[PDB]
Amino acid sequence: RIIVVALYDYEAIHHEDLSFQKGDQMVVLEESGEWWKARSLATRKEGYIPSNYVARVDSLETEEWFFKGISRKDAERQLLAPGNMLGSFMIRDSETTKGSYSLSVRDYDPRQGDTVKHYKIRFYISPRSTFSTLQELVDHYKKGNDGLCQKLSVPCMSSKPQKPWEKDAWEIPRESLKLEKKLGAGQFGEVWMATYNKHTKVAVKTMKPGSMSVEAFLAEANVMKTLQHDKLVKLHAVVTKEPIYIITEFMAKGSLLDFLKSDEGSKQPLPKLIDFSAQIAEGMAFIEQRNYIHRDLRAANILVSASLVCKIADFGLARVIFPIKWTAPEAINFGSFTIKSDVWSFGILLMEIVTYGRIPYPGMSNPEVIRALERGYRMPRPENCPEELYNIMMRCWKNRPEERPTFEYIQSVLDDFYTATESQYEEIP
Template identity: 65%
Template sequence: MSCYCSHAPEGNVNQIFELHILTFFSDEDIVIAQYDFQPASDSDLQFKKGDRLKIIKETGEWWLAKSLITGYEGYIPSTYVARAHTMEVERWLFKDMSRRDTERLLLAPGNKPGAFLVRESETTKGAFSLSVRDSTPEQGDIVKHYKIRALDNGGYYISPSTTFSSLQELVKYYARTADGLCQRLGSPCKTATPQRPWAQDEWEIPRETLKMVKKLGAGQFGEVWMGYYKNSQKVAIKTLKEGTMEPEAFLQEANLMKQLQHERLVKLHAVVTQEPIYIVTEYMANGSLLDFLKTDDGHKLKLPKLIDMAAQIAEGMAFIERKNYIHRDVRAANILVSETLHCKIADFGLARIIESEYTAQEVFLSIHAKSKVSI
C-alpha cells in the first residue's frame, strides 16, 4: 500500500476516528509531527505538522510508525517528531544544547530581541536555563541566561519570590511581563527544518535519481549545483570532469570520508561512481564563506561573530586531526555557511585524490618528454 495518501479511504472514517480516540491517551509510543514530511520512496510515511503517529519500531534515525490519521504505516525521520504528553512538544524547549550553541542559535538571522529558549542546565542536574536575546546600544545584540531552579515539590522558579508549578506556567508568566528579565519573552527561538536523514543503504546511487536545478559555481575540476534527490530532498551536487580521478581511487577515498561524521563537517550523503563522478552532500544555503563574506549580510558581521565562525572551523579541524586525517586544502572557498550562519568544512579528502592523480600525470608527462629528448 502506498504511503503517499494523506486522507483515509471513504467508509473507513469512523474506524480511523475510533483508532484516534483509543490511542489519544496511549503510552510513550505516541508522537506528534513537528514539521511536514514528504516521502521519497514507497516505504516512507507522509505526514503533516500536528499529525499524531504511533511508533512501532525505533531504529537509528528512521522509525517505523503508523499514522493515527490515515492508518497507514511507513518510515519517518525521528528528528521530525516529538513524544506526546512530554515537554518535547514545546517549541521553546531545546534539551541537549550547550551555552555557546544556544547563543549561536538565538543570534542567527530570523530571531529578534525577546526570542528565547529553555534548555537543560549544563552544570546542575534537574535544573534548566532560560536564554533570551537582548539588544543594547552599548553591546548590540547579545544573549542573557537565567538559571531556572527546581523546587522540592516539583515546581520551578527564577526568583524565589515567584514560583510556578511547571515550566509552561513560568514561560507564560514571563511572556506577559519581564519582571526582572532583560526582555519580556517573545517568540520561541526559530530554527530551520531538520535535514532529512539519509538512508544508510543509499550510498552508490543512480545518476537518474538526481535533478540539477541551479548552478552554484564552477572550478578547475568541475561544477557545484543545487538540486534534488528523488525530487524531494534538497542537496548539493558536485560534478567532477571526466579524467579528474580514477573511479576506483575516488570510491575508496569516499568510503573513508563517509566515516567522518561531525557537526562541523559537511555531510557526505552519496556518490555516483560512473564518470562523470557526482558527489552528493548536504545543502548549505549561504554557500562558501569566501562568497558570503562579500555579501551585504557578510559585511554586517561584527568581530565577535567572525571569531565565533573561526572557532567553529577550528572545532571541525580538531576533529579531523583526532581521526588522523588531513584536509590538504583548507581555505574560505571550502568552508560552507548555513542559513543560521553555522560553518562546516567541505571537500576534505578530495584534494588528496586529485593531487595524487595529477602528480602521477605530471610524472608520466615529464618522463615521456625526457624520453623524446633523449631519443
C-alpha cells in the first residue's frame, strides 16, 4: 500500500487526470511513467497524476528545504534567483560523494557579492555538532550559525515542475492545435506560439515540404525526442502529415540573440552572460556525451525561459534540411561536421554572447571571413571580455579540430570561472 503526497497544486486538464492540492495524500495504483494511476484520499477519485508532482510520505522530497537531483551549479542558480535572501538555503544530493548530501547557503561576500557556499554532510557537517535527522541539522543552523558563513533563513524558492505532456501523444492530429502568433519566419518554415487542445501553451515549428522524406525526418525526430536535458528545449509532439509541425515547450523570452539585443539583456552583467554560456556548454556536453552533433550552434538557436534558463533548440535539425561565420573551416571546406566543429561554433557563440548579440566578424563578407581564417586571423578580444574567457574562444578556434577542447572540459571551466577549485566546497573547523 503506497501512499504519496502532493508537493504542488494541480488542476486536471485531460479526460482522466485528477485535481489535487499541496498536502493531499493519495494511494498509488500503478506506476506507468510520467503519469501514475492513483486514488485521492481527499476526493476518493481514481485517475491520473503527474508522477513528479508527488513523493512518498515523510520522504525527504516532502521537505521544503530539500532538492533532489540538483547539481552544485544549478543549486547555485536557484538560490540566486529572485525571491531569495541572505541565509536562504537548501539540502541536496551531493554530486561527488554519491549517496551523500550537501547544504548550500546564500551569502554576501565582501569582494564577490551574493554567492552560494556549499558544505558536505556525512549526520554531521562538523564534529562539534552531530544530528540524526537533517531536520535536526536545519533547525540548529537556523538558530545562529555554529560556523557557517550565514545562519539559515528560509528554504530556497522552488519552481513548479512542467506539466508532463499527455500520455501516448507523441503524434497528434493537426486539429488539436491553434497557431495563434507567428513568432519567426524564414527559409524553411515558421515558428508560432500555439495552444494544444485548449489547455496547454506550446511553440510550433512549421516545416516547409523539402528534401526531405517525412519518414526520414520522423526517424530523426524520434532521436531528438530521446535527448532530454534541462538545457535542451523539450520536444512534446509532432504532426506527421506534410507540412510537418514540431511541437515544443514555449520559451517566454524567445531567442538568446533577440534577448541580448533587448533592454533587459543589455542590463545583464558579465557573470550572468558567462552563466548563460556555461548553461549552453552544459547542454553541449550532454549532446557530446550522447555522441550526437548539433551542426548549427549559434545564439539564434538558443532559447531563453522566463526565469533566464538557456535552452538549446534545433539540435540535429540541419542534418535533415548560410551561417558560415559560425562554421568551422573543415565543415566549410569538406562538409565534415563533428562535435568538434560544434566546439568551434561555441566559440563564436561565446563571442556573440559577450558582445550582446553583435554579428560575428563585423563588416566582413562571408568570403572575406573564409580567406581571413586561412591566414590565421581570429576575432580580437572585445572590451568587456576577460582575457581568460577570450582564451577559451581561441582554444575553440584551433585550426586542428582535435586540438579543440571538449564541451565537458569547457563546461567545467565556465561553470567555475569565478571559483578556485579548492573554494568549491567550504572547510569547517
